[PDB]
Design a protein around this nucleic acid. Structure first.
Length: 850
RNA sequence: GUUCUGCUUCAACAGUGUUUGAACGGAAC
């Protein structure tokens, strides 16, 4: 029973069936001071309290965040949903399919087996035949399981849009309202925190654990509050703001922490801006950068097609539980761990040049700075030209017209794509500037080499939907060697001509031999300098050009404010962008409960995990006279345990593949074979860099002690299982460190390994092993292989008691009479339960077949 | 000797990207 059910009440009395956990009633004093990001964790634990996977001390720990943040305590995080990128969800769907077969064979309803939460299979990357089977398998899954949706290949290939498309922000499901939140096997997951949705990327195994009902374990984080106030000056672009906030966070030191935004300034950042910041958190090391749901967010939901009524209810919910943000109201502000601040008036627009991308010069100083460079002695910021020559200039004819070319004249104005994701808005800004310039009679001298290659992507929507290309075209910028006259005037006058470039994508690549000076600036600034034809200008007190009719026009007259840009964005660009997606998804899923495993397949196979699984729990079996399969040292990485990349031709995996009619050229990678336990098991400990102490040298092998033969690890393990010998692995410190490897636990399980004895375990991996039924043993403080004399050739016996207690001590008796203690590393009752059930998957099977 | 090319590794930052570079792995002759 949920001890906090008394908090559940109807959001709207006219709808008794739709409830929400009123966190306000839990403890208003501490709740109202909590960072909004932490509130999402809180609500999640509270609604899922089950006195087991999520205990009430857990809810207490989160609620007491202000204090606990400093005691490094583990709390559970139960996401509202999961995202499985590309084909990373194959092993997971295979487990669930195999789990259904398992429940069938026990006389139960297979359909009782299903992912606890919604899962979105996002296969949006852009050999198609190489993935056909795996694609097919996941498609079957989307139909066989509930709440399992799929974004197929050949539809939305603009990731960002797909993620926001899948963002609920607030769930209205099974009679409850709760905040949207997730974890995905997609590194870009953190991007969605810009829209108020808490979440980040995790390992494949952790994602599956979520699908199995297991919370992500995590240290209650500190929360750096980043405040935004003031207004930015006129020429300041989104990228300027983003890079400032981004670069700052890096220095502040937020690695391992949460970053939550606030201050009246947040109201000035569009969802696109927020998403860009959140998405770059890997760069500054934060776990997540959260932007509470405010009116901007809500309005964004409408812009994407969600309907008014639903959205209105979402806001009502957020206001009721106290998770709706009003950045203008300081009284609402949380009690952050630390506060960093940024006055937008502080950001200063700049250009880089005239020779190095590192040499920054404020836009308002371009004139002075350039004129100083003319004098200065030939340096990175000097061309040295006889003081009299400064005001030089020659003339020339171009297309039956005359033009003068003074020093600092602009001959090239090229706009290219930026890698930074806030570029789209900035490009739109460049366009809106064009429109206003054209409307004001301005133009760009014909001889100026002007180009525009925005690249592909989201920017396309921003240009097209805003109907700005016509104007950009009129000024010489159309979607994609200077005139002979110009090159002559430059050289004949021995002039320092200028090139203006937007986009960081390669600098020295287009530095014309004729452009002695070159600057990097924002897209709109490029166009501007092209209208002005020179950088020796002071935009504050100098016309961009005299109206083809009467008066003069100033830069300030045609430069779009961030608000104007955001207005065009929200009423034309975003709506269009998402309409196209609902469609590309709808019409593509149209061309279409137990899995019919194909024996001829080499990509999908039913795992052995549940052979002879009995509905009743049998008492734990001791490990008797086991043999050590591998005697390892320190820092054995997950990639050593389960390698990534291609398959060696001299491997158990290769032989297996050969024996089935496959040639080397068609083996593919271990990664691609994750849905076939046969190949993955054969790849366990197949890393050529493996350093087995039994051999004192890098080799994917071990000694089959009975024979003394040295075979590839899998092979030795096979033999051992045939002979009926239990197996265990010895290891040094930090066992299982390294990046996520889907089979780092399952592989060892299929090699017959019943236990591991290490000096130290990397947190996650230890958990992964428990999950698969494997026993993690740890030497007592101070002891290890050498201390104890262990050679790895003795036969090990470990007698497990039926009354196991967390971190209990057990004896290990060798067949040489020797004896010693070790810690059986099951850290919690949940973990003990998985052990008794033989693993988390097995536990799930029993809980369902009733 | 030539050519083609990952649940990889490492590095860089006009600036974090379906980025750039390098390494290793893999395939073919």
């Amino acid at each position: 029973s949920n001890p906090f059910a008394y908090l559940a009440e109807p959001l709207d009395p006219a709808q008794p069936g739709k409830k929400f956990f009123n966190l306000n009633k839990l403890d208003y004093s501490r709740y109202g001071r909590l960072p909004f990001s932490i509130r999402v964790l809180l609500e999640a634990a509270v609604r899922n309290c089950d006195k087991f996977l999520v205990k009430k001390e857990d809810i207490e720990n989160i609620l007491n965040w202000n204090v606990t943040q400093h005691m490094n305590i583990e709390v559970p995080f139960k996401p509202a949903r999961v995202i499985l990128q590309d084909f990373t969800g194959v092993p997971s769907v295979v487990d669930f399919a195999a789990m259904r077969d398992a429940v069938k064979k026990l006389g139960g309803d297979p359909e009782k087996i299903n992912p606890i939460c919604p899962v979105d299979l996002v296969i949006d990357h852009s050999e198609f035949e190489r993935n056909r089977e795996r694609f097919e398998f996941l498609k079957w899954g989307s139909k066989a399981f509930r709440n399992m949706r799929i974004i197929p290949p050949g539809s939305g290939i603009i990731h960002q849009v797909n993620l926001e498309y899948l963002a609920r922000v607030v769930f209205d499901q099974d009679g409850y309202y709760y905040p949207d939140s997730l974890v995905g096997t997609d590194s870009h997951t953190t991007m969605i925190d810009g829209l108020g949705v808490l979440g980040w990327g995790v390992g494949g195994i952790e994602a599956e654990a979520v699908m199995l009902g297991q919370p992500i374990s995590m240290v209650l984080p500190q929360v750096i509050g980043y405040r935004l106030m003031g207004k930015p000056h006129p020429l300041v672009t989104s990228t300027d703001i983003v890079l400032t906030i981004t670069k700052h966070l890096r220095q502040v030191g937020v690695v391992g922490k949460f970053v939550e935004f606030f201050g009246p300034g947040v109201a000035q950042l569009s969802i696109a801006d927020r998403a860009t910041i959140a998405n770059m958190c890997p760069e500054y090391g934060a776990t997540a950068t959260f932007f509470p749901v405010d009116e901007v967010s809500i309005k964004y939901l409408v812009q994407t097609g969600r309907d008014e009524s639903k959205v209105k209810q979402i806001r009502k919910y957020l206001q009721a539980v106290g998770m709706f943000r009003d950045y203008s109201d300081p009284s609402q502000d949380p009690d952050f761990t630390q506060v960093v601040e940024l006055d937008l008036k502080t950001v200063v627009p700049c250009c880089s040049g005239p020779k190095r991308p590192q040499d920054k010069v404020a836009v308002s100083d371009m004139k002075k700075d350039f004129e100083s460079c003319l004098g200065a002695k030939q340096g990175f910021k000097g061309f040295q030209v006889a003081p009299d020559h400064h005001n030089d200039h020659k003339t020339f004819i171009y297309n039956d017209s005359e033009f003068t070319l003074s020093h600092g004249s602009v001959v090239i104005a090229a706009i290219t794509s930026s890698t930074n994701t806030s570029n789209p808005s900035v490009m739109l800004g460049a366009g809106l500037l064009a429109k206003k310039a054209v409307d004001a009679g301005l133009n760009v001298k014909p001889y100026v080499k002007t180009s525009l290659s925005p690249g592909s992507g989201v920017v396309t929507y921003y240009l097209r939907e805003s109907g700005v290309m016509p104007y950009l075209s009129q000024l010489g910028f159309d979607v994609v060697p200077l005139p002979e006259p110009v090159v002559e005037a430059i050289t004949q006058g021995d002039l320092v001509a200028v090139g203006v470039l937007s986009g960081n994508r390669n600098f020295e690549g287009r530095v014309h031999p004729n452009t002695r000076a070159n600057y990097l600036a924002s897209p709109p600034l490029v166009i501007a300098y092209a209208i002005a034809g020179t950088i020796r200008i002071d935009f504050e007190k100098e016309p961009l050009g005299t109206n083809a009719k009467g008066q003069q026009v100033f830069l300030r007259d045609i430069w779009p404010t961030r608000e104007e840009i955001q207005a065009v964005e929200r009423q034309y660009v975003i709506p269009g962008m998402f309409t196209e997606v609902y469609q590309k998804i709808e019409t593509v899923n149209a061309s279409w409960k137990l899995y019919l495993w194909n024996p001829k397949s080499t990509y999908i196979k039913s795992p052995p995990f549940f052979e002879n699984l009995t509905l009743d729990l049998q008492p734990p079996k001791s490990i008797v006279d086991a043999y050590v399969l591998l005697n390892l040292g320190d820092s054995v990485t997950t990639d050593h345990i389960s390698p990534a990349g291609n398959i060696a031709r001299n491997s158990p995996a290769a032989r297996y593949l050969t024996n089935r009619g496959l040639t080397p050229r068609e083996f593919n990678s271990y990664g691609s074979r994750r849905g076939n336990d046969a190949i993955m098991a054969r790849g366990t400990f197949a890393n050529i860099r493996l350093l087995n102490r039994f051999l004192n040298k890098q080799a994917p092998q071990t000694i089959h002690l009975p024979s003394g033969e040295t075979l590839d690890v899998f092979d030795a393990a096979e033999r051992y299982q045939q002979e009926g010998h239990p197996l265990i692995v010895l290891a040094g410190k930090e066992y299982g460190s390294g990046s996520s490897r889907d089979w780092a636990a399952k592989g060892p399980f299929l090699l017959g390994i019943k236990a591991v004895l290490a000096e130290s375990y990397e947190r996650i991996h230890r958990s992964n092993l428990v999950g698969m039924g494997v026993i993690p043993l740890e030497y007592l403080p101070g002891e290890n292989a050498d201390s104890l004399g262990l050679t790895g050739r003795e036969r090990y016996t470990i007698i497990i008691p039926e009354n196991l207690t967390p971190r209990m001590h057990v004896q290990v008796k060798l067949d040489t009479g020797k004896t010693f203690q070790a810690v059986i590393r099951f850290d919690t009752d949940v973990e003990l339960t998985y052990f008794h059930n033989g693993g988390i998957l097995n536990y799930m099977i029993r809980k369902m077949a009733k």
